[PDB]
Design a protein around this ligand. Structure first.
Ligand SMILES: CCCCCCCC/C=C\CCCCCCCC(=O)O[C@@H](COC(=O)CCCCCCCCCCCCCCC)COP(=O)([O-])OCC[N+](C)(C)C
Ligand SMILES: CCCCCCCC/C=C\CCCCCCCC(=O)O[C@@H](COC(=O)CCCCCCCCCCCCCCC)COP(=O)([O-])OCC[N+](C)(C)C
Ligand SMILES: CCCCCCCCCCCCCCCCCCCC(=O)O[C@H](COC(=O)CCCCCCCCCCCCCC)COP(=O)(O)OCCN
Ligand SMILES: CCCCCCCCCCCCCCCCCCCC(=O)O[C@H](COC(=O)CCCCCCCCCCCCCC)COP(=O)(O)OCCN
Ligand SMILES: CCCCCCCC/C=C\CCCCCCCC(=O)OC[C@H](CO)OC(=O)CCCCCCCCCCCCCCC
Ligand SMILES: CCCCCCCC/C=C\CCCCCCCC(=O)OC[C@H](CO)OC(=O)CCCCCCCCCCCCCCC
Ligand SMILES: CC(C)CCC[C@@H](C)[C@H]1CC[C@H]2[C@@H]3CC=C4C[C@@H](OC(=O)CCC(=O)O)CC[C@]4(C)[C@H]3CC[C@]12C
Ligand SMILES: CC(C)CCC[C@@H](C)[C@H]1CC[C@H]2[C@@H]3CC=C4C[C@@H](OC(=O)CCC(=O)O)CC[C@]4(C)[C@H]3CC[C@]12C
Ligand SMILES: [Ca+2]
Ligand SMILES: [Ca+2]
Ligand SMILES: [Zn+2]
Ligand SMILES: [Zn+2]
Ligand SMILES: [Zn+2]
Lengths: 671, 107, 671
């Protein structure tokens, strides 16, 4: 048998005292008042005493919203401490007003009434608390190293982190940003960015800072949603302290704000500037118009170069026409690169007619990249992540040009390629040119963003490449390990190239040999084993060492089982799990990326596609009025949605029970 | 009375003027009209043929969903609501004659 | 502008008449009674009139559960029709009792009060209706062809199907089976089986019959769940009209009833008969005991053959020991089959020592199969779906024996196999023996059911083989189509075997040839193209018909794209979708299959593993008492669970509003 007792004993209540608390619970005003006036005389019943479940009489009256017993206890001067916070968390405006008019606690000591109101996100109570001059202390920097922060971290790191988290949850309140903020949209933007940075820094408290940042982004989105006219939309988007607030939203990565339908509609009607009725057109006439503009890019470009002030000169300044001209010029560049592959023994030859055409687009690409560098700056250049491969293309083109010039100057004769040197400058130049050709032709992935049916697909690829990168570390570790083992076994039986039937050594021969003789060749062989191009007899030696053969063969088999059966199917399962997490927000992310692509063409800089590129208090007052109407509409909408969602608990049933019982004792008293 | 929405691809002076002056209010007004018209109760009353009315309204809402790219989901859900209303109206039949009168009616 | 009107006009109410219905809605008894006694004199207010929303005064009083206005209207003799059914659907026992004591309708004409009560599944109302002698008409046979059924199908097939569905939904009520049934468990079993058959037949009304069958199975499971002692469990399982009811449940495929924890515990303690403490033992001692019993199967078998009445004779009659002995004998048979592969030029040789051992297990397997046939019967034999491959094994073994005997009798000499005939009886016999070896060795999949970690895996394979079978039709259609096309192109360039370098024709040669010359070889080639074993140069001819080559090559490429890229990934996606639908019920299905495997060993027949197999109203009364206690417990439990689930709608809020308003007019009248 197990004895049961109370190992942590407390102070029990007496019979009359339990009767008093029970009368408070059922709401008998006559009995409670009689007990109070009897206690004032006899000092028998403690009015500030506790209950078995953690509450006192004022707490019971507050949770049961019985304002009349609550004010009776206030008039009898019961203990008051933390009951204000209890009324704040209870969301009872009458209790809040009465306690403003005048041990164990389930609240942290930092909990201030404004902060608990900001947690409860109740606009009424937050505004009544803000009516009095009440202050929230400022959080320090994200990476602050001052003496106060290091002392608070050293003394009690749990209370420091809880205090910072408590401050930021107070500040991220949608009601507390709707009031007491000169610019709620910009405040929500900066607060969301800061909460994202604190989510990145504080690893353990990551999810709560993530959800606070998401709450701020949702608040900004709904505030934009409450607009009701195109002027108000453009006052919001064009406020600066054009499209300044939109550029700020793009800078702070507010994809929910950017992907608003009204903002996307305004961006679309700015994008289709020259064509007012592109929204309602057929597929065939859209394709015909696109090809018609795309076949006239040199005419429009030379029109801009000659006279910007004409029906054709400023026609390319429209964003869609500029995008079509850039795409058409780049596609003609790729067509010429395809034509370039269509005497070959000259050492360091002069450039042909096709390369003589290619050279100005190469110079224009380099000039455009360095012009974007010099104009935008550094962080904006490195943030794009396409400029890395753009730099790779420019570097490979420059290397090809330099090697071609070096070969043309240094060599003159016509020697057949069969006896050329292996590190010949012409060979190096042509290899670099082919690599740059591939990089140029995969640069077209960036144009899938502007299409409706390919943009989310590109977003899904960009989100699953991260998991491919995660898997590549494990696969390369396994590859290095098995390459090391197979080298350590097989590098005694290395054979010269002369002993081979056709003077070829390596896995690229007709008869594959020496697949595990050197570390480079072992890495190549175990890489090509994934696609099945490495035959089985590469695990063979001329000597009769059958045990050596069997250990090498089972090493190869273990590598194949780990890679193709385990790791590849692991990669399939990982990307399949990752795709479902992206399919929900793919539309929003695609709309954000397409907005960035659209705003990339709104500038006057970079207008000419290559190779042609080498040849004020009223605004504040109107914005304040629009935001004031927006805040009123948003508070009304979130009040309506609070009165439309579920919201109901057993609090409501015990509230109705309390009202019925208080009335019951009232009419039993009056009758 | 509810004012009539114009054509899906209408190019008249009133529509182009309303699109140019305030495109948000124009789109909100058209969306508001179509949400009013797609009401199952408002098709159950005031309609000479609720089944055919729901059919044509669902097709039109599908076309406006195809055209209006930004307001796609709401027109999709209105078309789905009209299709569900037609399905439930057919579901409420209680005899094979009524089923065949519904299926064999021609106008 | 669109005009709005009422195209289907109805009869509006007058002002006093709307006032009367509004007074009924708010529950003013004084106003309603005054209006009734004024209408009795003046005949100005119609008491049976309709409202704008389809109801009359009695309907409003019934839906608002206001029994006093309802009985007032009953005393004033308002229209009564279908208000009883309205009270049945409303689940108000007072309204039901009062209407029992005494146009447009949303109910079908077949709706009878007992049937609507059975739909509502309210035990109280169903019992009060059953107190009066009330009858439900019998549904006919599933495939009945009588004149009444064919006439009802021809006249109005919608009303006939709705009537049958209405009858079966009435009969499948858990309360209506808990009452008025001599055997609720057997009634639920037969009703679930019948509803499954009607689900199979009625294709359009499939889901509702499926959910009714599932409801009956759940009712039987919960009725078994309400047992509270091992005697009651065994009275339920051992009732017959041992384990007769359990065998009936297995026959009717009640997997939920079979997979009950108490039933599985009783089956386990019958299964581990000889070992009382196998439940609490270590893995190593379990493995040691299993190998110890498995190495002694001939000793236990010969002990049973010599003397069944001993410590070793009846030791094999225990189910676990019998299962271990069968498994050990069959594993030794497979070990001998492995040994059989370890002079070869004799035409029709005598059987060797290994085959002379194999022959009695072959005879024992055939004898056991025909004995199971003769004992169990026909449907039980063909239902197992393992007996098909068992028959295949027996037929191949018999064919091997017959061909070996024919070869031994007909041939005597010793000719080397290089010049044997291609259809030689020895060659045919050895091919059939190898095929039977594979079938014998994959017969071990059936033993994965008895294991804890492999049984659900076998269930998942058995459920995804259906989708593989579904996909195989499409793949074989594509295979036949592309084989036909490639034959029609390539059968002009068929070459003889002599013209080949090594006198070999077909895709099984060193140099693959003639892959699309005949239909059989084209089917083989396009089958082997799936696994990559068919090289690319099989699409080549000796002549210089390059267009012919290109069309053949692009046909091969189109087939590879359809098969490996589209169809194989389709199969992967289909099985991945199918696995998630099986992972939920895999435990229940595995427990059912393991119960079937356990009951297969409970019989005295088939005790000896091969080759050794060729060498009474008190029961009804106790069952009735146990079922009566079970029904009382189940009704109490489902009443408690009805008072524990959500169950609450705006009906409850308008009920409380009606009570408050009726009281309000009452006290305004009394004061
Ligand atoms: C993102 C990362 C950066 C990407 C861009 C890098 C641009 C780099 C540009 C620099 C190009 C230099 C070319 C060689 C000239 C010097 C020379 O004589 O070479 C010697 C050595 O030659 C080598 O080692 C070959 C180097 C080839 C690099 C190819 C990089 C491809 C990246 C693909 C990426 C996908 C010749 O041999 P020897 O001395 O006679 O003996
Ligand atoms: C489930 C389906 C049923 C399964 C069990 C079937 C049992 C069947 C048993 C019957 C076995 C008969 C053997 C041949 C004897 C007759 C003979 O002379 O053959 C002639 C023809 O020979 C053939 O056509 C070969 C037939 C081989 C069948 C193999 C089936 C494998 C099923 C695997 C399934 C996995 C010899 O040639 P000729 O005439 O000299 O010229
Ligand atoms: C001697 C060796 C010779 C080898 C010769 C052959 C070489 C072949 C090299 C092939 C490399 C192919 C790389 C293709 C990348 C495609 C990425 C698709 C997804 C995508 O859009 O990714 C973007 C990231 O940028 C990127 O993914 C940029 C990738 C840059 C790669 C640069 C390689 C040099 C995300 O989009 P976003 O960046 O707009 O997202 C918002 C801002 N973060
Ligand atoms: C000239 C040609 C020469 C060819 C030579 C080589 C031939 C190789 C043939 C290989 C055939 C392998 C078949 C393996 C089937 C494994 C099935 C695993 C899943 C499984 O347990 O399936 C059961 C169904 O039975 C089954 O799946 C029974 C399958 C019977 C196949 C018979 C083939 C003859 C379901 O379990 P359950 O039946 O207990 O379910 C409850 C009662 N429905
Ligand atoms: C991720 C990184 C961690 C991976 C951890 C390990 C995963 C499982 C690895 C299993 C390796 C099996 C190697 C077998 C072997 O030696 O074969 C080569 C050699 C080749 O001679 O095999 C043999 O010599 C034995 C012949 C029988 C092999 C049976 C293998 C059955 C299972 C195959 C894999 C599943 C499909
Ligand atoms: C399921 C049943 C219905 C399937 C419906 C069709 C599905 C898509 C079929 C696509 C067939 C492409 C055939 C290409 C072809 O002729 O190649 C052979 C031949 C071989 O010479 O290809 C050519 O001659 C053209 C060379 C370029 C081919 C580019 C193909 C890109 C897409 C490949 C498939 C996706 C990976
Ligand atoms: C991949 C196969 C078919 C070979 C063809 C290669 C290229 C000639 C293709 C592949 C990707 C194509 C691009 C994919 C997407 C677009 C966006 C498209 O713009 C839209 O979606 C129209 C609406 C809008 O811009 O608002 C204009 C054509 C373009 C650049 C396409 C131009 C032609 C490209 C470069
Ligand atoms: C597959 C590899 C490891 C080669 C070995 C082949 C056979 C020797 C294996 C494969 C499947 C095995 C069987 C899989 C499952 C079981 C059930 C197992 O029983 C239990 O799970 C114990 C608990 C119980 O029976 O209640 C007894 C051994 C047995 C027949 C195994 C016996 C050994 C088998 C035939
Ligand atoms: Ca760039
Ligand atoms: Ca059998
Ligand atoms: Zn600091
Ligand atoms: Zn118009
Ligand atoms: Zn009949």
């Amino acid at each position: 048998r197990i004895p049961l007792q109370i190992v942590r004993a407390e102070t029990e209540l007496s019979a009359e005292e339990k009767a008093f608390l029970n009368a408070v619970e059922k709401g008998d005003y006559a009995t409670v008042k009689q007990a109070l006036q009897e206690a004032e005389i006899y000092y028998n019943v403690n009015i500030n005493c506790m209950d078995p479940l953690g509450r006192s009489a004022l707490l019971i009256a507050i949770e049961n919203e019985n304002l009349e017993i609550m004010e009776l206890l206030l008039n009898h001067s019961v203990y008051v401490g933390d009951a204000l916070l209890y009324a704040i968390r209870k969301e009872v405006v009458g209790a809040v007003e009465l306690l403003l008019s005048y041990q164990f606690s389930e609240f942290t000591p930092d909990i201030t009434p404004i902060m608990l109101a900001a947690h409860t996100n109740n606009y009424e109570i937050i505004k009544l608390l803000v009516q009095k001059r009440v202050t929230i202390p400022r959080p320090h920097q994200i990476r602050c190293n001052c003496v106060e922060c290091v002392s608070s971290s050293e003394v009690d790191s749990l209370r420091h982190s809880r205090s910072r988290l408590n401050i930021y949850k107070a500040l991220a309140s949608p009601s507390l940003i709707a009031l007491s903020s000169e610019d709620p949209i910009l405040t929500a933007f900066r607060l969301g960015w800061e909460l994202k940075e604190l989510s990145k820094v504080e690893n353990e408290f990551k999810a709560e800072y993530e959800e606070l940042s998401q709450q701020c982004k949702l608040f900004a989105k709904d505030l934009l949603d409450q607009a009701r006219s195109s002027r108000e939309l453009e006052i919001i988007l064009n406020h600066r302290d054009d499209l300044a607030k939109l550029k700020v939203a793009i800078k702070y990565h507010q994809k929910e704000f950017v992907a608003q339908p009204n903002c996307q509609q305004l961006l679309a009607t700015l994008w289709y500037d020259g064509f007012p009725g592109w929204r309602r057109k057929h597929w065939v006439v859209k394709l015909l118009t696109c090809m018609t503009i795309g076949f006239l890019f040199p005419m429009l470009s030379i029109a801009y170069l000659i006279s910007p002030r004409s029906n054709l000169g400023l026609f390319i300044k429209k964003p869609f026409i500029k995008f079509i001209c850039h795409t058409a010029s780049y596609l003609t560049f790729l067509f010429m690169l395809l034509l370039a592959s269509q005497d070959l023994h000259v050492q360091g030859p002069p450039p042909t007619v096709v390369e003589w055409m290619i050279l100005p687009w190469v110079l224009g690409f380099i000039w455009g990249e360095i012009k974007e560098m010099w104009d935008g700056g550094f962080t904006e250049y490195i943030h794009d992540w396409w400029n890395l491969m753009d730099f790779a293309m420019n570097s490979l083109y420059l290397a090809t040009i330099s090697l071609k010039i070096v070969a043309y100057v240094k060599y003159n004769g016509s020697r057949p390629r069969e006896e050329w040197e292996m590190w010949h400058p012409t060979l190096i130049a042509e290899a670099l040119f082919a690599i740059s050709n591939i990089l140029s032709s995969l640069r077209l992935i960036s144009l899938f963003t502007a299409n409706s049916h390919l943009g989310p697909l590109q977003i899904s690829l960009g989100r699953m490449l991260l998991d491919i990168l995660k898997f590549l570390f494990i696969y390369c570790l396994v590859l290095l390990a098995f390459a090391n083992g197979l080298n350590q076994l097989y590098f005694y039986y290395e054979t010269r190239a002369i002993d081979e039937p056709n003077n070829c050594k390596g896995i690229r021969c007709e008869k594959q040999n020496n697949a595990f003789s050197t570390l480079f060749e072992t890495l190549q062989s175990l890489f090509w084993s994934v696609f099945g191009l490495l035959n089985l007899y590469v695990t063979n030696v001329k000597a009769r060492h059958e045990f050596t053969e069997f250990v090498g063969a089972t090493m190869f088999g273990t590598y194949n089982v780990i890679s193709l059966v385990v790791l590849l199917n692991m990669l399939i399962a990982m990307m399949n799990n990752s795709y479902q997490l992206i399919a929900d927000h793919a539309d929003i992310e695609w709309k954000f990326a397409r907005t960035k692509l659209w705003m990339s063409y709104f500038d006057e800089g970079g207008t000419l596609p290559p190779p042609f590129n080498i040849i004020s208090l009223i605004q504040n007052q109107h914005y304040q009025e629009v935001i004031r109407n927006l805040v009123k509409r948003y508070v009304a909408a979130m009040i309506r949605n609070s009165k439309t969602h579920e919201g109901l608990t057993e609090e409501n049933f015990k509230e109705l029970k309390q009202d019925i019982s208080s009335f019951r004792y009232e009419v039993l008293d009056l009758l």
